């Protein structure tokens, strides 16, 4: 799970799968939700 820090502007959560690995994008609006 790649997560963004609070200092960055855009909030987005990257998901990495296992066996080509599947990658998903999860962007959010509020910092408490992240």
Partner 1 sequence: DRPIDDIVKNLLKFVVRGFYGGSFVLVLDAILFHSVLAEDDLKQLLSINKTELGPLIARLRSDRLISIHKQREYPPNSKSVERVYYYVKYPHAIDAIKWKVHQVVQRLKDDLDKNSEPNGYMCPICLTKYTQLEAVQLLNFDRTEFLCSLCDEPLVEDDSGKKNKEKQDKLNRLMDQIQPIIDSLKKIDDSRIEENTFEIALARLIPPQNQSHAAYTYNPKKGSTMATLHINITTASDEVAQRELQERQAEEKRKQNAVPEWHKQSTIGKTALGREERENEKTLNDYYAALAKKQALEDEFEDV
Applying CB under 8 A, the residues found at the interface with partner 1 are: 1-5, 7-10, 12, 14, 29-30, 32
At its nearest, how many Å lie between partner 1 and the CB of residue 20?
20
Smallest distance, partner 1 to C-beta of residue 15, A: 13
Of 18 and 31, which CB lies nearer to partner 1 in the complex structure? Answer: 31
Q: What is the 3-state secondary structure (H, E, C) of 1-34?
A: CECCCCCCCCEEEEEECCCCCCEEEEEECCCCCC
Among residues 18, 17, 15, the alpha carbon closest in space to that of 3 is found at 15
CB 19 to partner 1: min, Å: 21
């Amino acid at each position: 799970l790649q997560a963004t820090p609070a200092s960055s502007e855009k909030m987005m959560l990257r998901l990495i799968g296992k066996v080509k690995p599947q990658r998903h994008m999860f962007s959010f609006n509020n910092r408490t939700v992240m």
